[PDB]
Amino acid sequence: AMIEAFIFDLDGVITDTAYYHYMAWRKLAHKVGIDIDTKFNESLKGISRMESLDRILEFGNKKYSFSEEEKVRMAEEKNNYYVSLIDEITSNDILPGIESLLIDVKSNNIKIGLSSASKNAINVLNHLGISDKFDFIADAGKCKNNKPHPEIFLMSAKGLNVNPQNCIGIEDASAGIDAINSANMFSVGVGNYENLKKANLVVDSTNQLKFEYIQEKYNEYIVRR
Numbered sequence: 001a002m003i004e005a006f007i008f009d010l011d012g013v014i015t016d017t018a019y020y021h022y023m024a025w026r027k028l029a030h031k032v033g034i035d036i037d038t039k040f041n042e043s044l045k046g047i048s049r050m051e052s053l054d055r056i057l058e059f060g061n062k063k064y065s066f067s068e069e070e071k072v073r074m075a076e077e078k079n080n081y082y083v084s085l086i087d088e089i090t091s092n093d094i095l096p097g098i099e100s101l102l103i104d105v106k107s108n109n110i111k112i113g114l115s116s117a118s119k120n121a122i123n124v125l126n127h128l129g130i131s132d133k134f135d136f137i138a139d140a141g142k143c144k145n146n147k148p149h150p151e152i153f154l155m156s157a158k159g160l161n162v163n164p165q166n167c168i169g170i171e172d173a174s175a176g177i178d179a180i181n182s183a184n185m186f187s188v189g190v191g192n193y194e195n196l197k198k199a200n201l202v203v204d205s206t207n208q209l210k211f212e213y214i215q216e217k218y219n220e221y222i223v224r225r
């Protein structure tokens with residue numbers, strides 16, 4: 001019952017991008033009479049670009065009032081602004097304990113994957129300086145279903161050519177945790193316990209993501225699954 005892989009989400013596990021997306025979406029949203037707050041945005045978190053835009057427009061009952069071309073234009077302006085913000089990310093922005101985890105996973109001959117809904121995930125990993133640590137990066141551009149649908153996590157399992165039942169999925173949002181469990185994987189949640197209650201394991205912060213602790217908990221889950 002050995003682990004075949006650790007599949008990570010990007011935002012809130014490898015590094016923090018949620019605030020940058022929010023700053024970028026907030027600017028475009030104001031231009032259509034919609035002012036999103038860090039509470040509403042918490043439902044745009046880990047969501048793909050065009051879906052995220054539709055939810056923002058929805059919030060103002062104008063999701064169906066724009067043509068997709070016009071939505072394409074709006075998305076572009078937002079993307080350019082988001083890309084400008086993340087281009088200042090460095091290795092110092094890697095969440096605490098992640099590098100050490102990435103190393104230990106690799107020393108235990110276990111694959112590593114990233115299942116992020118962002119087509120900017122590659123750009124971010126290169127700025128962090130750890131793109132070489134990832135065996136497979138799911139292409140959000142080919143994913144047709146956002147979390148909590150398990151597609152993005154199944155894509156990394158397919159990509160790495162491993163059994164999802166032997167995979168560990170790490171995430172900080174409830175939608176992602178639902179996607180991980182729906183992919184029949186061991187789910188590890190990072191953050192608030194109440195919001196991440198459906199996770200198989202919940203830790204407080206990325207510093208709590210220790211390899212031996214994750215493995216001991218994984219073995220427990222497998223025996224009881």
Ligand code: NA
Nearest residue numbers: 009011012172
């Ligand atoms: Na996340």
Ligand code: NA
Nearest residue numbers: 181185186187
């Ligand atoms: Na599970």
